[PDB]
């Protein structure tokens, strides 16, 4: 269906205001997340089909910011956004981030970059999403 | 190629329509040159002498009075001035449009 | 991307698809119907006006063209005979058609339409007047059974409704042509049956029965997934629902 | 190339030569007596007549076509005046149609009249003598188009006249046609 | 290269070979275990990580190239308590007021206006079928070992469009979506399809309505084929099968009709891994000679432990579209079982009759034909959909 109603506004607002922190740490992103209480998004009389579909679309939309050509800090913010969306969802089973084959190797290389950048919060969160297997190996996002 | 080679009279080719400021300049040349359609054709390089004759023939149908009025509104003749006036007025027409 | 809709193979310069294959040939020979035959389109008001207009035009043509034929033939013979008396007699027979064209032109439209079972060129009405958008026998049915002014088009009166309900039982709710004729209101068997079924307690159910419950349960167990079932498609298998 | 099937002309385009040629003969007979041919190139008339005859033999499959769209399939080229003849004939048939009530009742126009000519041609001579205003032995004018526009005024007697061309000429008019030495030198500079 | 990419963005993709495409996944996932069908441990609050720490910290240090204490610090900092604005137990049925989301403001606008006697209800959101397909199959495992999805198996998503095109809308599509496995063959997808065209019947029986035919089209004809990338895959497992591809090619290749040359193969020749296909591109499938289905591969992906691993449910129907029933013209309420022509009683031709109305209108108490008409048995695609 595409961009969920009003979701892109919130996602871009959070991502930009995080990027304005000049910081890469997960704690600042969580402070912004909890100040405006982003985690409440999955409530709101969402019957199961809408819950799952909105989770899928939101994770793909955040994927688009987790991908290039965005720079390191904004990609890190997008990774935190993906983590928050995935781990605050109320789905059963937990719906997944759609990851393309053209994106999977670039994203493993991004894991390597996060490790080498010493900004280990993003690297750990990516490995945590892998352990949760939030990433879905799908042809397209 | 096919046997149905339609034939009709094509001498009536599409010529560029005459402009209003161009018509005013034609009347000015009538005033300041006369009815020498060859020298007018030189003054109007866009228009060949036969176009000048055709313009005379069309204008004389109703605007012969204007032909006479222009012809009596005599002026000193300068080729360079006429060329500058033509190009400047046409450029100003384009800018206005 | 949507250009691939059926048929998947469509010709660019001619617009047709592949010919009928063997299986389709044998299916047609066996009378097995295709799903494209299931498309039906509604009669809209201007279509009904067009049908009346076409029928009146057809009747007027059928009436006048013989008259114009007589006029022209008598004129042609009048033009070539040298006998004066025969010339005048042929002119008289031409004047007959000359007056008859005027008289027929002045007829009222109802007189032009005539009786419900009068002859019409349904093929010509279909393939010229209607541009072929509706078939000949379809137009014939519509006209002669619903649209020709002699068919009853009025709402059912209370007395008519009760008498329909009362007499339908004597025939066992069968033989509805007899029911329609006995009702005496010039209804058609289809009209009577439609009215009766829209209020028949034996068809439309507040109630339930063992076989209906059995079929509903079996179809539900066969086809339900979670909360979903095809509520209004189960109607086909057990009777009296919609 | 309409007389046999081809990828350019599927069956809905194919037609029998006899029917269309009869229709075109029935159309050209109308053309001349209506003054349409005199003074004109005829082949436009033939082209328009053939195009409309082919259309009306199966209009449901053919009213969607067009002059060029037609002529290109049979590898034929068409006159531009073909459209002029088409407009003329369409006006003529719309004038014809109003004479019969069972054609008038359909309120025919350019879109619809094409499929009805099969009915009009069966009474043509009757339509003509109910349609022309010139009822003399020798409602609408049966006169060539060049006058159907109506003269602005109907040729009053021309002003045949003479003048006294022996009078003295005004030298001022003669001298006005002469360039001054200033203008002569201007011409020399320009030349 | 068999490297996915869009041809028209978010509408269709460039071509790749399915088997090489799966191997291209597995060269980046094999041995790592992220593609597996076994349950991994999940993220949780920092206060209960003690049991998981021994296993998690060593692996985190190994992969992140950091110390055990650094791994513990990352695990504590990245705990879900920093993200769970919702406590474990809060219900989804109400919008929390303690939020600044524009999305939840728009959701408030969606929900609140329905809280009126005219609109209070718990009906469907937009469409009913999809989650019902997911819930009844998602997360299950088979009772038989032979019906188990192989780890890392490719899962395609195939949209089988109905033969009944709306012919007033073209953006959205009539289809039912079925998932298929890469290793499985086209024969199995052909067999799974429940389309009504297999049930087609006919014949004229106005004189003897009870003599309806004993054979459905499935019993008389069994022809069917898929068409991908210019090749046909026709079924020939039964004598009731004819190779319709030959009939199609012999006409389509005779002129520059707008299509390229084609090639012929059987249904049983190809697995879905053997295909080279485009996602979102309209391909073709057909059966019973005239029942063409447009085939669109809407998705292809690896299997994962959260997926339906019970292969008895495959090809896994996952979406469907809701055709309307053909209701009788007499009663305008019940579904038709008969259709008549030349009917002197019916107001129109054709006229559709239910079994109850058909028999009573056209026959007497003992079943003799009355009036003039022709009748045919009818199976409703608006019902058997
Ligand atoms: Zn099939
Ligand atoms: Zn039913």
Curated annotation (Swiss-Prot), chain A:
Region of interest (SNAPC3-binding), residue spans: 1-141
Subcellular location: Nucleus
Domain of life where this protein originates: Eukaryota
Disulfide bonds listed in the record: none
Role: Part of the SNAPc complex required for the transcription of both RNA polymerase II and III small-nuclear RNA genes. Binds to the proximal sequence element (PSE), a non-TATA-box basal promoter element common to these 2 types of genes. Recruits TBP and BRF2 to the U6 snRNA TATA box.
Subunit and interaction comment: Part of the SNAPc complex composed of 5 subunits: SNAPC1, SNAPC2, SNAPC3, SNAPC4 and SNAPC5. SNAPC1 interacts with SNAPC3, SNAPC4 and TBP.
Protein name: snRNA-activating protein complex subunit 1
Species whose genome carries this gene: Homo sapiens (Human)
UniProt gene name: SNAPC1
UniProtKB/Swiss-Prot annotation, chain B:
Domain of life: Eukaryota
Protein modification: Phosphorylated by CSNK2A1 during mitosis, resulting in its release from chromatin and suppression of polymerase III transcription.
Tissue expression as described in the entry: Isoform 2 is highly expressed in cerebellum.
Induction: By Epstein-Barr virus (EBV) resulting in the stimulation of the EBV EBER genes.
Domain Myb-like, residue spans: 10-60
Protein localization: Nucleus
Subunit structure: Component of TFIIIB complex. The TFIIIB complex has two activities, alpha and beta. The TFIIIB-alpha and TFIIIB-beta activities are required for transcription of genes with TFIIIC-bound internal promoters and PSE transcription factor-bound external promoters, respectively. The TFIIIB-alpha activity complex is composed of TBP, BDP1, and a complex containing both BRF2 and at least four stably associated proteins; YY1 facilitates the formation of TFIIIB-alpha activity complex. The TFIIIB-beta activity complex is composed of TBP, BDP1, and BRF1.
Disease tied to this protein: Deafness, autosomal recessive, 112: A form of non-syndromic, sensorineural deafness characterized by postlingual progressive hearing impairment. Sensorineural deafness results from damage to the neural receptors of the inner ear, the nerve pathways to the brain, or the area of the brain that receives sound information.
Protein name: Transcription factor TFIIIB component B'' homolog
Provenance organism: Homo sapiens
UniProt gene name: BDP1
Residues of the full protein shown: 286 to 382 of 2624
From Swiss-Prot, chain C:
Domain HTH myb-type: 148-202
Effect on the protein upon substituting residue 44 to E: In NEDRSO; uncertain significance
Chain ranges of the Myb-like domain: 109-147, 203-242
Species annotation: Homo sapiens
Superkingdom, taxonomy of origin: Eukaryota
Ranges annotated as DNA-binding: 176-200
Disulphides: none
Name assigned to this protein: snRNA-activating protein complex subunit 4
Protein task: Part of the SNAPc complex required for the transcription of both RNA polymerase II and III small-nuclear RNA genes. Binds to the proximal sequence element (PSE), a non-TATA-box basal promoter element common to these 2 types of genes. Recruits TBP and BRF2 to the U6 snRNA TATA box.
Pathological association: Neurodevelopmental disorder with motor regression, progressive spastic paraplegia, and oromotor dysfunction: An autosomal recessive disorder characterized by delayed motor development and developmental regression after the first year of life, followed by progressive spasticity with gait alterations, paraparesis, and oromotor dysfunction. Most individuals have cerebral, cerebellar, or basal ganglia volume loss.
Record's subunit section: Part of the SNAPc complex composed of 5 subunits: SNAPC1, SNAPC2, SNAPC3, SNAPC4 and SNAPC5. SNAPC4 interacts with SNAPC1, SNAPC2, SNAPC5, BRF2 and TBP.
Cellular localization per UniProt: Nucleus
Residues spanning the membrane: none
Curated annotation (Swiss-Prot), chain D:
Chain positions of Sequence repeats: 1-69
Free-text description of this protein's post-translational modifications in UniProt: In response to oxidative stress, Cys-146 is reversibly oxidized to cysteine sulfenic acid. Oxidation of Cys-146 impairs formation of a ternary complex with TBP and DNA and down-regulates expression of target genes in response to oxidative stress.
Localization of this protein: Nucleus
Stated consequence of mutating residue 146 to A: Abolishes response to oxidative stress. Abolishes the decrease in the formation of a ternary complex with DNA and TBP in response to oxidative stress
Superkingdom classification of source: Eukaryota
Keyword Metal-binding among record annotations: yes
Induction (record text): Down-regulated by epigallocatechin gallate (EGCG) treatment.
Location of the region described as Required for the formation of a ternary complex with DNA and TBP in the Swiss-Prot/TrEMBL record: 142-148
GO CC annotations, alphabetized: nucleoplasm; nucleus; transcription factor TFIIIB complex; transcription preinitiation complex
Region (Required for interaction with TBP and formation of a ternary complex with DNA and TBP) location: 150-191
Single Gene Ontology MF annotation: TBP-class protein binding
Family listed: Belongs to the TFIIB family.
Protein name per UniProt: Transcription factor IIIB 50 kDa subunit
Native species: Homo sapiens
Lineage: Eukaryota, Metazoa, Chordata, Craniata, Vertebrata
Gene symbol of the encoding locus: BRF2
């Amino acid at each position: 269906m595409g961009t969920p109603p009003g979701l892109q506004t919130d996602c871009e607002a959070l991502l930009s205001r995080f990027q304005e922190t000049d910081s890469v740490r997960f704690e600042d992103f969580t402070e912004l997340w909890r100040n405006m209480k982003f985690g409440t998004i999955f409530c709101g009389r969402m019957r199961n089909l809408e819950k799952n579909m909105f989770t899928k679309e939101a994770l793909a939309l955040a994927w688009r910011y987790f991908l290039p050509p965005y720079t390191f800090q904004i990609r890190v913010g997008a990774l935190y956004l993906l983590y928050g969306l995935y781990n605050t969802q109320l789905c059963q089973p937990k719906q997944k981030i759609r990851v393309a084959l053209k994106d999977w190797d670039e994203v493993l290389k991004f894991q390597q970059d996060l490790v080498n950048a010493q900004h280990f919060d993003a690297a750990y969160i990516f490995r945590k999403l892998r352990l949760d297997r939030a990433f879905h190996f799908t042809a397209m996002p | 190629g096919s046997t149905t080679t339609y034939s009709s009279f094509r001498k009536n080719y599409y010529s560029k329509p005459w402009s209003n400021k161009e018509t005013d300049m034609f009347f000015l040349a009538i005033s300041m040159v006369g009815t020498d359609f060859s020298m007018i054709g030189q003054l109007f390089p866009h228009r060949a002498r036969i176009e000048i004759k055709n313009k005379f023939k069309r204008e004389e149908k109703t605007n012969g009075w204007r032909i006479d009025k222009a012809f009596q509104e005599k002026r000193p003749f300068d080729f360079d001035f006429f060329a500058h006036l033509l190009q400047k007025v046409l450029a100003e027409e384009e800018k206005r449009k | 991307m949507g250009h691939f809709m059926k048929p998947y193979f469509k010709d660019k310069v001619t617009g047709v698809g592949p010919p009928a294959n063997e299986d389709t040939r044998e299916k047609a020979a066996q009378g097995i119907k295709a799903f494209e035959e299931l498309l039906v389109t509604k009669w809209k008001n201007w279509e009904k006006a067009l049908l009346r207009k076409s029928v009146v035009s057809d009747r007027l043509q059928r009436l006048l063209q013989p008259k114009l034929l007589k006029l022209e033939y008598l004129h042609q013979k009048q033009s070539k005979v040298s006998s004066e008396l025969e010339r005048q007699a042929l002119e008289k027979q031409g004047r007959e058609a000359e007056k008859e064209i005027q008289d027929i032109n002045q007829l009222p439209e109802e007189a032009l339409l005539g009786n419900r079972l009068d002859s019409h060129d349904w093929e010509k009405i279909s393939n010229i007047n209607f541009e072929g958008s509706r078939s000949a026998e379809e137009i014939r049915k519509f006209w002669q059974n619903s649209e020709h002014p002699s068919i009853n088009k009025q709402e059912w009166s209370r007395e008519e409704e009760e008498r329909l309900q009362a007499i339908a039982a004597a025939h066992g709710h069968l033989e509805w042509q007899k029911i329609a004729e006995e009702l005496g209101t010039s209804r058609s068997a289809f009209q009577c049956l439609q009215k009766f079924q829209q209020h028949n307690k034996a068809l439309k159910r507040k109630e339930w029965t063992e076989e209906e419950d059995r079929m509903l349960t079996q179809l539900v167990q066969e086809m339900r997934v979670g909360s979903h079932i095809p509520y209004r498609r189960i109607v086909y298998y057990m009777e009296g629902r919609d | 190339k309409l007389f046999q099937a081809s990828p350019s002309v599927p069956a809905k385009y194919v037609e029998d030569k006899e029917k269309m040629l009869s229709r075109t003969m029935q159309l050209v007979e109308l053309a001349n007596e209506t003054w349409l041919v005199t003074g004109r190139h005829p082949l436009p008339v033939i082209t328009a007549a053939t195009f409309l005859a082919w259309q009306s033999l199966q209009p449901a499959d053919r009213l969607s076509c067009s002059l060029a769209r037609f002529c290109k399939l049979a590898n034929v080229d068409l006159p531009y005046p073909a459209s002029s003849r088409l407009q003329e004939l369409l006006a003529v048939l719309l004038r014809m149609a109003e004479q019969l009530a069972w054609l008038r009742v359909l309120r025919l126009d350019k879109r619809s009249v094409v499929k009805h000519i099969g009915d009009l041609l069966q009474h043509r001579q009757s339509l003509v003598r109910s349609a022309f205003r010139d009822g003399t032995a020798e409602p609408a004018l049966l006169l060539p188009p060049c006058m159907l526009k109506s003269p602005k005024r109907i040729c009053p007697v021309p002003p045949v006249s003479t003048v006294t061309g022996d009078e003295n000429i005004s030298d001022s008019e003669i001298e006005q046609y002469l360039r001054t030495p200033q203008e002569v030198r201007d011409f020399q500079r320009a030349q | 290269c068999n490297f996915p990419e869009y041809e028209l963005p978010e509408l269709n993709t460039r071509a790749f070979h399915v088997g090489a495409f799966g191997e291209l996944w597995r060269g980046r996932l094999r041995g790592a275990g992220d593609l597996s069908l076994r349950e991994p441990p999940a993220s949780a609050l920092p206060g209960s990580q003690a049991a998981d720490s021994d296993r998690e910290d060593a692996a985190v240090a190994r992969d992140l190239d950091c110390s055990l204490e650094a791994a513990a610090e990352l695990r504590a900092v990245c705990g879900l308590d920093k993200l769970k604005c919702l406590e474990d137990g809060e219900d989804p049925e109400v919008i929390p007021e303690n939020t600044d989301l524009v999305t939840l403001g728009v959701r408030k606008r969606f929900l609140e206006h329905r809280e009126e006697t005219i609109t209070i209800d718990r009906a469907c959101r937009q469409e009913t079928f999809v989650y019902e397909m997911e819930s009844h199959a998602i997360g299950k495992k088979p009772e038989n070992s032979a019906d188990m999805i192989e780890e890392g198996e490719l899962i395609l998503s195939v949209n089988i469009l109905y033969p009944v095109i709306f012919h007033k809308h073209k953006e959205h599509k009539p289809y039912q979506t079925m998932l298929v496995l890469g290793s499985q063959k086209l024969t199995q997808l052909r067999d799974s399809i429940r389309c009504v065209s297999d049930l087609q019947i006919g014949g004229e029986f106005s004189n003897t309505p009870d003599q309806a035919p004993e054979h459905i089209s499935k019993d008389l004809y069994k022809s069917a084929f898929f068409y991908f990338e210019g090749t046909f895959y026709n079924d020939k497992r039964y004598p009731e099968c004819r190779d319709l591809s030959r009939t199609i090619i012999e006409w389509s290749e005779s002129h520059d009709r707008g299509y390229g040359k084609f090639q012929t193969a059987r249904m049983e020749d190809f697995t879905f891994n053997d295909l080279c296909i485009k996602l979102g591109f309209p391909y073709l499938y057909c059966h019973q000679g005239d029942c063409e289905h447009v085939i669109v591969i809407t998705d292809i992906r690896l299997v994962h432990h959260d997926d339906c691993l019970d292969r008895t449910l495959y090809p896994l129907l996952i979406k469907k579209h809701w055709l309307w029933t053909r209701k009788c013209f007499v009663c305008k309420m019940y579904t038709a079982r008969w259709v008549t022509n030349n009917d002197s009683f019916a107001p129109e031709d054709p006229c559709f009759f239910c079994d109850v109305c058909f028999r009573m209108l056209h026959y007497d108490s003992e079943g003799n034909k009355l009036g003039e008409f022709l009748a045919y048995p009818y199976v409703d695609p608006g019902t058997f959909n």
